[PDB]
Structures are given as C-alpha cells and as structure tokens.
Design a protein around this motif. Structure first.
Motif, PDB file in Angstrom:
ATOM      1  N   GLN A 178      19.134  28.114  23.952  1.00  0.00           N
ATOM      2  CA  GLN A 178      18.352  28.831  24.965  1.00  0.00           C
ATOM      3  C   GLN A 178      17.415  27.875  25.701  1.00  0.00           C
ATOM      4  OE1 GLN A 178      17.439  32.783  22.298  1.00  0.00           O
ATOM      5  NE2 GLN A 178      16.907  32.862  24.477  1.00  0.00           N
ATOM      6  N   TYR A 214      14.193  27.973  28.465  1.00  0.00           N
ATOM      7  CA  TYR A 214      13.217  28.970  28.904  1.00  0.00           C
ATOM      8  C   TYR A 214      11.827  28.380  28.933  1.00  0.00           C
ATOM      9  CZ  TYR A 214      12.556  29.109  23.859  1.00  0.00           C
ATOM     10  OH  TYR A 214      12.380  28.747  22.537  1.00  0.00           O
ATOM     11  N   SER A 215      10.981  28.929  29.793  1.00  0.00           N
ATOM     12  CA  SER A 215       9.616  28.439  29.943  1.00  0.00           C
ATOM     13  C   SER A 215       8.718  29.017  28.855  1.00  0.00           C
ATOM     14  CB  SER A 215       9.076  28.798  31.332  1.00  0.00           C
ATOM     15  OG  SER A 215       9.255  30.173  31.603  1.00  0.00           O
ATOM     16  N   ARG A 216       7.690  28.269  28.466  1.00  0.00           N
ATOM     17  CA  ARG A 216       6.718  28.776  27.509  1.00  0.00           C
ATOM     18  C   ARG A 216       5.977  29.972  28.096  1.00  0.00           C
ATOM     19  NH1 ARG A 216       2.320  24.896  24.798  1.00  0.00           N
ATOM     20  NH2 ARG A 216       4.216  24.161  23.727  1.00  0.00           N
ATOM     21  N   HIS A 217       5.569  29.854  29.353  1.00  0.00           N
ATOM     22  CA  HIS A 217       4.897  30.960  30.022  1.00  0.00           C
ATOM     23  C   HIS A 217       5.750  31.421  31.187  1.00  0.00           C
ATOM     24  CE1 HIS A 217       1.353  29.847  27.678  1.00  0.00           C
ATOM     25  NE2 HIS A 217       1.475  28.616  28.143  1.00  0.00           N
ATOM     26  N   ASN A 242      11.287  24.760  27.435  1.00  0.00           N
ATOM     27  CA  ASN A 242      11.821  24.682  26.080  1.00  0.00           C
ATOM     28  C   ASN A 242      13.335  24.680  26.062  1.00  0.00           C
ATOM     29  OD1 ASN A 242       9.369  24.769  24.485  1.00  0.00           O
ATOM     30  ND2 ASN A 242       9.198  26.943  25.038  1.00  0.00           N
ATOM     31  N   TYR A 247      15.765  25.553  22.961  1.00  0.00           N
ATOM     32  CA  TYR A 247      15.808  25.994  21.566  1.00  0.00           C
ATOM     33  C   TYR A 247      17.254  25.931  21.087  1.00  0.00           C
ATOM     34  CZ  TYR A 247      14.934  29.057  17.486  1.00  0.00           C
ATOM     35  OH  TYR A 247      14.857  29.616  16.231  1.00  0.00           O
ATOM     36  N   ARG A 262      14.990  31.279  35.654  1.00  0.00           N
ATOM     37  CA  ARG A 262      13.631  31.771  35.500  1.00  0.00           C
ATOM     38  C   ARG A 262      13.575  33.279  35.204  1.00  0.00           C
ATOM     39  NH1 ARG A 262       9.924  30.344  39.908  1.00  0.00           N
ATOM     40  NH2 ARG A 262      11.369  28.593  40.214  1.00  0.00           N
ATOM     41  N   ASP A 263      14.690  33.975  35.404  1.00  0.00           N
ATOM     42  CA  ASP A 263      14.748  35.413  35.136  1.00  0.00           C
ATOM     43  C   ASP A 263      15.100  35.709  33.677  1.00  0.00           C
ATOM     44  OD1 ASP A 263      14.189  35.994  37.806  1.00  0.00           O
ATOM     45  OD2 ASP A 263      16.293  36.238  38.335  1.00  0.00           O
ATOM     46  N   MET A 264      15.392  34.659  32.915  1.00  0.00           N
ATOM     47  CA  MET A 264      15.846  34.809  31.544  1.00  0.00           C
ATOM     48  C   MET A 264      14.927  34.041  30.616  1.00  0.00           C
ATOM     49  SD  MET A 264      19.220  36.088  32.112  1.00  0.00           S
ATOM     50  CE  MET A 264      20.103  35.586  30.657  1.00  0.00           C
TER      51      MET A 264
END
Ligand code: CA
Lengths: 278, 99, 8
Positions: free
Chosen positions: B8, B10-13, B24, B26, B97-99
């Motif tokens: 995955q 994805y952004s922290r915030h 990130n 993961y 950014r939507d996920m």
C-alpha cells in the motif's frame, strides 16, 4: 490485566555473506520494549521503551549474554535443519519463534506458547496443554522425539507459568498504564466520481490505536455485506493507524448511506455521512 | 515456499497540494525477509527513504514500512517499487491521493 | 526475560 509478554525471534542464514542474522524482539502488551540485534560489532540487548531504562546494568548484561547464547544455539539449529531436510549448504534459510505468556487480570497464565517455523512454515509448536508437541512435518518429528525424551515441555511449562509471568509483573511495575494507551479514530467521508450515474463514498478512519477497528456502510439501517471495498488497516508511521471502507452508490442517493466506525477508544461508535460543502 | 508482498502507498495525513506530508509504502506478506524497496517521484528514485524495523506476523510473513517526506502537487506522480524473490520482476504501485 | 532455547 490482561497483560502479555511476547518474544519474536528470527534467525536468518546467508552463506558466504557473514554469520546468520539473529534477532530477539520483546513486546509488553504488543508494544516493543527490548531488542537484541546480532548485526553489530558489540551487540547488546537495548531498552526500546524509555521506561525500561529503569533496569540496571545487571539486567542488560544478563539479557545480552543469554541472547548471545541463544544466537549460537540457533546457528547450530540452522545447520541441523539442512540435514533434516537434505538441503544445500549454500542457500539462505530462516528460523522464527514466537514465545510468551498471556496473563489474566487475576495474574494467572491464560495461555503460554512456544512455536517455531522454518522457512516461513510451521515446524513445531507446544500444545495448549503445555505438555505435548505438534510437529508439522517429518523433520519436526525428530525434534519432537528429542524434546519428549528430554522433558522439554516440562521445562517450558515451568518457564511459562513462572518466569514469564513473574518477569511480566516486574516489567509492568515500571511501564504499565502506558499499555492502556488508547487513541480514538477521527472519521470523514470523501466523494469520488464513477462512470455514468454512479459515485463512490469512502469513509476514512484516522489516528487511532490500537489497530483493531471496524468500518461499515449501511443503506437505511442494514450493513452492506457485499460490494463494500476496504483496505487492510495500515500504520500512519506515527504510532497510529488508518483504514477506509467505500461503497459505490447511485448519483443523487448519497444521503441514503451511513458509515459506522467501531473502536475501543470511542465512548460510542461513530456515525457519519457524505457532507457536501455549501 | 515463497510469499508475495502486498503493497500500500499512502500519505500519513490527508494530502493537500503545497503542504508538507509523509508518503508511506507499507509492504506485507512476504517471505523470505530480504527485500528491496524504492520510492519514486515522477519516475526517478527518491534518495532519502527511511525504513522501519522489520517485523513478522502470526502467519510468519514479514512486514515493513518505508517512508519519505514529500509535498504533493496536483501533477507530481509518486510510486513505491518492490523487488522480492517471490516475483520475477519488481512490482510498482502508484500513489492515488483518493486511496 | 526470554527463555533459553534448546536445540532442534
Ligand atoms: Ca499484521
């Protein structure tokens, strides 16, 4: 209680490239508090939670020397297993162990465990009775018979019911109430286009701990047990976790759907909907 | 026996264009534990990528978190690329950014 | 305190 004292052990060989890499990682209530990493010039057990600094030099010395003893025993096991399995001497292999005790609020052992895996597959495990072994394959039968003869289960029961429990108690006097830490999720719904007359509603949960959480979507009061898309819960990297769940719904029907967020930290479950800006 | 990594990105915030954030990557469900993880901005390796310690799961599979600082814009593209012996070729996963 | 492991 309840409380838990867990150790995760990894031993990885790398022939021609150095000694096996050996690691002991300990968790008090799922929070890492100690670690031994053999991949260093003067490897030492080190405190991984500042509360553990309370322990004196005598603790770290003893733990370090025990760790290095364990490490060298595993060095041997790695060679033993090549034999058991008729494997080449040239490849990398891994042994993993999970060892520990879960203790109830009354201070008694709920569950003790001691399980091994070789190359990512079950090898042998102490059964719940703390008296017998489950061997996963033909090679593990060899270990099993050797351990039955030496009364290894009895040694383990004594450790699990006594030592493990007594140490957990002692660690807690230094760092408990910390393990009770709870961070509640904050939720919001985002809105995303789809082809034709469909849209996606994505219900996010952020900043929560521990990782256990549940997200559901309901149409008019009934959970949408089908076609709900989600992600596996994931670390934010700051100690908290994230998750989302989404559903595809008809354009114009967004207000018919409700997202629910269940988490141990909340006074009560969250309920929310797509809130379009004015 | 080999287990293929799940990934995955994805952004922290929640991302906001022009706002410093953390990206990130993961990576889970892999075995053996040796793994090589890169993050890319518009196709080019990001030099400063940090790694959590590696841990393992109840099913024995390993997981790790890679991460890097970033300031999203409307048009910059980010990805995480993973090389692991369970896969013939490195697997790349784009940030959405939507996920 | 982790147990002292016995050989496989
Ligand atoms: Ca996990």
């Amino acid at each position: 209680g309840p409380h838990s004292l867990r150790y995760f052990v990894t031993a990885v060989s790398r022939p021609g490239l150095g000694e096996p890499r050996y690691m002991e990682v300990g968790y008090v209530d799922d929070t890492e508090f100690v670690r031994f990493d053999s991949d260093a010039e003067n490897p030492r057990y080190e405190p991984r939670a500042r509360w553990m600094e309370q322990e004196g030099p005598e603790y770290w010395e003893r733990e370090t020397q025990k760790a290095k003893g364990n490490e060298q025993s595993f060095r041997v096991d790695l060679r033993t297993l090549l034999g058991y399995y008729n494997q080449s001497k040239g490849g990398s292999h891994t042994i993993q162990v999970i060892s520990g005790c879960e203790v109830g609020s009354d201070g008694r052992l709920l569950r003790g465990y001691q399980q091994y895996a070789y190359d990512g597959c079950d090898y042998i495990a102490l059964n719940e009775d703390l008296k017998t072994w489950t061997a996963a394959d033909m090679a593990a039968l060899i270990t099993k018979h050797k351990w039955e003869q030496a009364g290894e289960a009895e040694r383990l029961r004594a450790y699990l019911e006594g030592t493990c429990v007594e140490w957990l108690r002692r660690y807690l006097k230094n760092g408990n109430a910390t393990l009770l830490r709870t961070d509640s999720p904050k939720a919001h719904v985002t809105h995303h286009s789809r082809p034709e007359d469909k849209v996606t509603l994505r219900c996010w949960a952020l900043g929560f701990y521990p990782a256990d959480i549940t997200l559901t979507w309901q149409l008019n009061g009934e959970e949408l047990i089908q076609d709900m898309e989600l992600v596996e819960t994931r670390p934010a990297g700051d100690g908290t976790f994230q998750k989302w769940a989404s559903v595809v719904v008809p354009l114009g029907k967004e207000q018919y759907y409700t997202c629910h967020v269940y988490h141990q930290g909340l006074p009560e479950p969250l309920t929310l909907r797509w809130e379009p800006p004015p | 026996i080999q287990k293929t990594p799940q990934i995955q990105v994805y952004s922290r915030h929640p991302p906001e264009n022009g706002k410093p954030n953390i990206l990130n990557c993961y990576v889970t469900q892999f075995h053996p534990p040796h793994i090589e993880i890169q993050m890319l901005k518009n196709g080019k390796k990001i030099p400063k990528v940090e790694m959590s310690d590696m841990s393992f799961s109840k099913d024995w599979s390993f997981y790790i978190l890679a991460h890097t600082e970033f300031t999203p814009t409307e048009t910059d593209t980010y990805a995480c690329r993973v090389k692991h012996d369970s896969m013939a070729e490195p697997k790349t996963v784009y940030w959405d950014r939507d996920m | 305190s982790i147990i002292n492991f016995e050989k496989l």
